[PDB]
Ligand binder design. Sequence first.
Ligand SMILES: COc1cc([C@@H](C(=O)N2CCCC[C@H]2C(=O)OCc2cnn(C(C)C)c2)C2CCCCC2)cc(OC)c1OC
Length: 121
Amino acid sequence: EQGEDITSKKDRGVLKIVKRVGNGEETPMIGDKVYVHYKGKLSNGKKFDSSHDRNEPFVFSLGKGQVIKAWDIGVATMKKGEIAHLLIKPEYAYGSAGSLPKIPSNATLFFEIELLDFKGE
Ligand SMILES: COc1cc([C@@H](C(=O)N2CCCC[C@H]2C(=O)OCc2cnn(C(C)C)c2)C2CCCCC2)cc(OC)c1OC
């Protein structure tokens, strides 16, 4: 329950720590194509997911809600080369409905994210 509160409502739903600083000043804009590696888990550590388990960069369009809200918020704060940890309350992840079978109701999630690169499509 440590980290910078990076939510808009300042409700501590998404807590962020920079583990490795990136390069430059620039962070990605909404609509940028983003390339990451990540490892992620449920706080109840019975499900761990990883891009490394394919060794393939995970790619998505930032701010489009193609991923959980906490990602769109979180990756937008990141500099290229940055590694960050996000602790995520259910309101910014899968909420009260969850996403069975992977995600139970009201789950807290953790991710380690490396931002590799972003480009304007
Ligand atoms: C609920 O469905 C999934 C959720 C995730 C994982 C997850 O929650 N995400 C995957 C990495 C991006 C953030 C977040 C998420 O938005 O996933 C939904 C998702 C999966 N692929 N996509 C692409 C279409 C962009 C979105 C969890 C993390 C905790 C440990 C268990 C898995 C990976 C998945 O497979 C890669 C999922 O299945 C499609």
